[PDB]
Amino acid sequence: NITIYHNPACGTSRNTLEMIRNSGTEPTIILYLENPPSRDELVKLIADMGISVRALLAKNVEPYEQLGLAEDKFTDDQLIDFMLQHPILINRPIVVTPLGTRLCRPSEVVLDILQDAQKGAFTKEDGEKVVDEAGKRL
Ligand SMILES: [Cs+]
Ligand SMILES: [Cs+]
Ligand SMILES: [Cs+]
Ligand SMILES: [Cs+]
Asked: Name one GO biological process term.
């Protein structure tokens, strides 16, 4: 039972999706920019990811820049509500499986929560080797 909050225009997100698929399951794909999680869902996701709210914030996007989010003047809940109101602020990809939830940055973090091993070697789209045919992480 796998869900990925995906951005098809992001290489990290594409590589993570192809590793989910190479473990033998097709995930539910949520295009978070157009359908972001709700507030309770977002809070849960963050809790399950084990990271700070601030660590999920994408920098180098318009709302982060124009809202001055780089400055330490925001509570966690203010940052969560900015994420709900401006979903491009949610970094990507977020993957949820029966084993847990992770911000998969870098993409191979997803190997921690995939239940089934990669079915064969996996090489990222830019040629970076991740797992060899034997299944060893490179
Ligand atoms: Cs939602
Ligand atoms: Cs695993
Ligand atoms: Cs293998
Ligand atoms: Cs890259």
From this structure: response to arsenic-containing substance
